[PDB]
Design a protein around this ligand. Structure first.
Ligand SMILES: CCN(CC)COc1ccc(Nc2ncc3c(n2)N(C)C(=O)N(c2c(Cl)cccc2Cl)C3)cc1
Length: 340
């Protein structure tokens, strides 16, 4: 058990192992320097981790997820600790990850990137996503602000999956969401993430948001105008009779010519975009198939695009008491083993 020291950071008391020095607030979260590894890190102190069933299960969920992800393009766990000496005294949870420079959103917003630049960034997103999906995990909330990238243009996927108010109106919180998930059309798959990737890729190519809807319905119109209104085949997969019914009230529209939308773009980028932005999620290209697309010929290496070990999330189906979620969380904290 290391030695911990106390420090108040904005009306917040932090108690962390001596190895972590020079803590400074960044959002709760502090950047620090881990003298044991020589790594600049981000330290998050969870706010009231076990105040309710929903919160206790959320804490367990986040810890299980982070402990599982071990990939260069996905945020992983460097350390997790509690100053608590036993389960009875257990109340706080601190999570340590690599400190990232800035998110994609804060970096290239309103800016058109070069094609080589787009290839590299999207390739890394797809490499991370192939790893995540292989574990049967769905990000569900990919957006430029959940993608961090350093100077060398190295990228990590962060913040896996929301307040209905924050999804209302002209907001980036909904612009990258697959239509089937935005309007709850059905039980969704992992290709919801691919739709997100297409929205991101287009924005990097044009410097412009692909479907900046002013609300849910305006966004659906922007989408259908580009990809076309649904055909009979997809209509049947929409479990919601009301949703299905609303869809049918719309004037039919054919899919637009993508080369005429992304004018001047690499023809290979245009082709991949058409394969990612397919309305019927059963037909979208998967992350693994995309990595093999000729657009990434310059980066693709089948021997350097690993998959994840199986991820047991049967716990999502369980209804336990706070003390039970708390005890499971504690076990995950003490059984933690740092990466090499
Ligand atoms: C205008 C306000 N400024 C202050 C100057 C804030 O700007 C920042 C603040 C931090 C960073 N880098 C940064 N790298 C890694 C993480 C992270 N922030 N954050 C915030 C987390 O929460 N991380 C995290 C997750 Cl996603 C899961 C579990 C544990 C952690 Cl620590 C990682 C970049 C810009």
């Amino acid at each position: 058990r290391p030695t911990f020291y106390r420090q108040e950071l904005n009306k917040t008391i932090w108690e962390v192992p001596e190895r972590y020095q020079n803590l400074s607030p960044v959002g709760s979260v502090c950047a620090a320097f881990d003298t044991k590894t020589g790594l600049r890190v981000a330290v998050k102190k969870l706010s009231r981790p076990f105040q309710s069933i929903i919160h206790a299960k959320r804490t367990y969920r986040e810890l299980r997820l982070l402990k599982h992800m071990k990939h260069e393009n996905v945020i992983g766990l460097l350390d997790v600790f509690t100053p608590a000496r036993s389960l009875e005294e257990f109340n706080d949870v601190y999570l340590v990850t690599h400190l990232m420079g800035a998110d994609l959103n804060n970096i290239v917003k309103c800016q058109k990137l070069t094609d080589d630049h787009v290839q590299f960034l999207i390739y890394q997103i797809l490499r991370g996503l192939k790893y995540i999906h292989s574990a049967d995990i769905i990000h569900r909330d990919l957006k430029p602000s959940n993608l961090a990238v350093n100077e060398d243009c190295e990228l990590k996927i962060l913040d896996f999956g929301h307040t209905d108010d924050e999804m209302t109106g002209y907001v980036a919180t909904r612009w990258y969401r697959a239509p089937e998930i935005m309007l709850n059309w059905m039980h969704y798959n992992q290709t919801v993430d691919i739709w997100s990737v297409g929205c991101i890729m287009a924005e990097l190519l044009t410097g412009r948001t692909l479907f900046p809807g002013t609300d849910h319905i305006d966004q659906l119109k922007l989408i259908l105008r580009l990809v076309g209104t649904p055909g009979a085949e997809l209509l049947k997969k929409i479990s919601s009779e009301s949703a299905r019914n609303y869809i049918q009230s719309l004037t039919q529209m054919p899919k637009m010519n993508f080369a005429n939308v992304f004018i001047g773009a690499n023809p290979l980028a245009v082709d991949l975009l058409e394969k990612m932005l397919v309305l019927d999620s059963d037909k979208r290209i998967t992350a693994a198939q995309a990595l093999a697309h000729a657009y990434f010929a310059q980066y693709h290496d089948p021997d350097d695009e690993p998959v994840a070990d199986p991820y047991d999330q049967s716990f999502e189906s369980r209804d336990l008491l706070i003390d039970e979620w708390k005890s499971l969380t504690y076990d995950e904290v003490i059984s933690f083993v740092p990466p090499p």
